[PDB]
Amino acid sequence: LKPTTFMLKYDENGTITDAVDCSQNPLAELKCSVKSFEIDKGIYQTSNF
């Protein structure tokens, strides 16, 4: 186990249906920042470096 950050989608019936890493690629971290699974085109600012 490793200290990470995930993001979980619950359904109507309180079931974990989908997850995402915040560490594997910049694309998933974009999903972590905007807090959405589907992302339209464009640039989006995220955290610093």
Binding site: S33, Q45, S47, N48
Partner: protein, 97 residues
Amino acid sequence: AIPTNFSISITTEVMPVSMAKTSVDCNMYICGDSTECANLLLQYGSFCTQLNRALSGIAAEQDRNTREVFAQVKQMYKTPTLKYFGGFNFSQILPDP
């Protein structure tokens, strides 16, 4: 009274359209090279998130201002080779190859 002769005036006009868009890293400023600040900042939360959204939102408008003024033509026209047109010497307003 009715005027007979006339004159022709050219009057200048100055208007601002934009402003230098900025950006601020938090930890370079509010922390400033110390990890323990960054070990303390996370109690306050993602205020770095909201201000980056705000300042970039200003930055989107600054390009939006310039674009909404200028980008109105749809053909990129060519400057003619002549610059003097029947007493109309455009030698100061047109560019020069």
